[PDB]
């Protein structure tokens, strides 16, 4: 059963989709759920979009991340067209051609954070923590809510360094535990490409 969500759209563009969903009897919602099957992204001609929360979750959920052109060209062609040839090809940050969305729906047997325990620590800005934790959960990780509450499986500390007011503070997590401390972008890039990226580029140096 088709359940749809929109991202990156102007109000008049949303109105098109609302009309299109009404014609074909497809559920369109404002909030992304587990029940949601399709995330409809605004892209350019190259099927390249921007990174939104809905975009990340669409990949992490293994959902049909689809360009909004799939709506407009199906309006023009009068029939409801195939999702395969309208799936988004990548994003403005990580790559115009990484088939992130395709590789996520393809590999659900293997999920990118298969054996990791992830704890978010300290302040966070634009993305709700409970959402980023869900995204991490969606790629088959374990969410830990306290630094002491870690458990033959690997721990990772996730931090957003530009949210900290006393910037000397995010080098002090190595004192509390011996687990690695990466930036928030490690999660975000890894979900976007749907490949677990090597922590080396994201690793925050800790104080001895």
């Amino acid at each position: 059963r088709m359940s749809m969500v929109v991202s990156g759209l102007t109000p008049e563009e949303f109105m098109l989709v609302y009309k299109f969903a009404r014609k074909h009897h497809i559920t369109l919602t404002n909030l992304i759920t587990e029940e949601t099957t399709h995330v409809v992204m605004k892209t350019d001609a190259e099927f390249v979009c921007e990174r939104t929360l809905k975009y990340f979750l669409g990949i992490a959920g293994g959902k049909w991340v689809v360009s909004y052109f799939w709506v407009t060209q199906s309006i023009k062609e009068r029939k409801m067209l195939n999702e395969h040839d309208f799936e988004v090809r990548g994003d403005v940050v990580n790559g115009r051609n990484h088939q992130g969305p395709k590789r996520a729906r393809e590999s659900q047997d293997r999920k990118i954070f298969r054996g990791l325990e992830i704890c978010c620590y300290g302040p966070f800005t634009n993305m709700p923590t409970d959402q980023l934790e869900w995204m991490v959960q969606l790629c088959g990780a374990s969410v830990v809510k306290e630094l002491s509450s870690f458990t033959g499986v690997h721990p990772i500390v996730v931090v957003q360094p530009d949210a900290w007011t006393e910037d000397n503070g995010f080098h002090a997590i190595g004192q509390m535990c011996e687990a690695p401390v990466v930036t928030r972008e490690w999660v975000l890039d890894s979900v976007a490409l749907y490949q677990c990226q090597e922590l080396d580029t994201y690793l925050i140096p800790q104080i001895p």
């Binding site: 921007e50 940050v93 530009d162």
Partner: peptide
């Protein structure tokens, strides 16, 4: 058109 709120983008960052 009028005043509409807009969902976050996640640009390049360290």
């Amino acid at each position: 058109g009028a005043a509409y709120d807009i969902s976050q983008v996640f640009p390049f960052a360290k």
